From a paper:
Activated coagulation factor XI (FXIa) is a highly attractive antithrombotic target as it contributes to the development and progression of thrombosis but is thought to play only a minor role in hemostasis so that its inhibition may allow for decoupling of antithrombotic efficacy and bleeding time prolongation. Recently, another serine protease in the coagulation cascade, factor XIa (FXIa),7 has emerged as an attractive target, because it may allow for a more selective reduction of fibrin generation: FXI is activated via FXIIa after contact activation or by thrombin in the course of the positive feedback loop for thrombin amplification, but it is not involved in the tissue factor pathway, which is key for fibrin production to cover a vessel wall leakage. Thus, this form of “selective coagulation modulation”8 by FXIa inhibition may allow for a decoupling of antithrombotic efficacy and bleeding risk and offer the opportunity for better antithrombotic protection to a much broader patient population. In this study, we describe our drug discovery efforts, resulting in the identification of asundexian (BAY 2433334, 80), a direct, potent, selective, and reversible small molecule FXIa inhibitor for oral application, which is currently being investigated in clinical Phase 3 trials.
To explore FXIa inhibitors, we synthesized tetrazole 1 (inspired by chemical matter published by Bristol Myers Squibb in 200723) which showed good potency (FXIa IC50 = 9 nM). A docking experiment of this compound in the published X-ray structure of FXIa24 indicated that the 4-aminomethyl-trans-cyclohexyl residue would occupy the S1 pocket. An X-ray cocrystal structure of tetrazole 1 in complex with human FXIa then revealed the binding mode with the key hydrogen bonds and hydrophobic contacts. The 4-aminomethyl-trans-cyclohexyl moiety was indeed found to be located in the S1 pocket where its primary amine forms a direct ionic interaction with the carboxylate of Asp189 and a hydrogen bond with the backbone carbonyl of Gly218. The S1 pocket is the only deep pocket of the FXIa active site, and ligand 1 extends from the S1 pocket into the S1′ and S2′ pockets. We hypothesized that this orientation in the binding mode toward the prime sites might facilitate the required selectivity versus other serine proteases such as FXa and thrombin, as potent inhibitors of the latter use the more druggable pockets of their nonprime site (S1 and S2; S4).25 The cyclohexyl-bound amide carbonyl oxygen forms two hydrogen bonds with the protein backbone forming the oxyanion hole (OAH in Figure 1). The ester binding pocket (EBP) is not occupied with substituents of 1. Located in the S2′ pocket, the tetrazole moiety of 1 forms a hydrogen bond with the hydroxyl group of Tyr143 and a water-mediated interaction with the carbonyl group of His38. In the S1′ pocket, the phenyl ring of the benzyl side chain participates in a hydrophobic contact with the Cys42-Cys58 disulfide bridge.
Residue numbers in the entry: 388 to 503, 509 to 623
Write the structure that this text describes.
């Protein structure tokens, strides 16, 4: 996250860190708890993941440095990528992880509601870079970002097809954005004091550049897909 601040424990309890363990253990992508057995993330995260056997889902993490050899994690039973997905920039950038067992919800691990509205209180969160050439951050970062219209977003990405299945967010002057390692995490919007998972962090041109908003999977356009897959 560029131009963000440190989160505190329990601030974003639906935020997970998805680790790969091949050839070494490291953060791969963010994700969001949407059900006791269900993580919503980006399809692109799984490019060259050989199978779910190498994945570990960590919930209730603030600092990456908390994760040791005895730290509990969830195994991944199944990766469900949208059948029309080919590439992040071409949309359908959405995936479910079915966990091997149920998350018992606590102060530190809680589900986020799907959307059913003008969202004015939207936040992007993750352990990603603070600038284009950087490293994964120890402490989960947060930044408040304004949504932009799909009409404005298309004008900034004339090499790409921006559809109603995408939502864009960013400042005209730049300064705050998702960056490398934030993908798959949530764009969380608070509406009537309830948090909604409005976006999944997907792609963009660089990080926090002027007139280059972040592009997110528009979760409300996939609610029927999610409900079909989650039963
Ligand atoms: N301004 C809009 C932003 C929107 C999110 C974008 C993003 O995050 N894309 C992923 C793609 C990706 C995900 C997973 C695997 C390969 C590639 C990505 O780049 N991840 C990534 C990179 C680097 C490390 C890494 N680990 N250690 N050092 N670097 C770890 C994950 C950046 C643009």
């Amino acid at each position: 996250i560029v131009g963000g601040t440190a989160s505190v424990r329990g601030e974003w309890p639906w935020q997970v860190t998805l680790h790969t363990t091949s050839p070494t253990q490291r953060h791969l992508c963010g994700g969001s708890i949407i059900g006791n057995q269900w993580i919503l993330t980006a399809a692109h995260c799984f490019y060259g993941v050989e199978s779910p056997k190498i994945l570990r889902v960590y919930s209730g993490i603030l600092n990456q440095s908390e994760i040791k050899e005895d730290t509990s994690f969830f195994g991944v039973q199944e990766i469900i990528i949208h059948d029309q997905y080919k590439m992040a920039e071409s949309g359908y950038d959405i995936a479910l992880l079915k966990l091997e067992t149920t998350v018992n919800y606590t102060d530190s691990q809680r589900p986020i509601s799907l959307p059913s509205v003008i969202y004015t209180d939207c936040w992007v969160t993750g352990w990603g870079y603070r600038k284009l050439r950087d490293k994964i951050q120890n402490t989960l970062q947060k930044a408040k970002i304004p949504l932009v219209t799909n009409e404005e977003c298309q004008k900034r990405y004339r090499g790409h097809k921006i559809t109603h299945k995408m939502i864009c967010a960013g400042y005209r002057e730049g300064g705050k954005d998702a960056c490398k390692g934030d993908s798959g995490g949530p764009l969380s919007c608070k509406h009537n004091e309830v948090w909604h998972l409005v976006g999944i962090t997907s792609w963009g041109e660089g990080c926090a550049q002027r007139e280059r908003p972040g592009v997110y999977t528009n979760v409300v356009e996939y609610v029927d897909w999610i409900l079909e897959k989650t039963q």
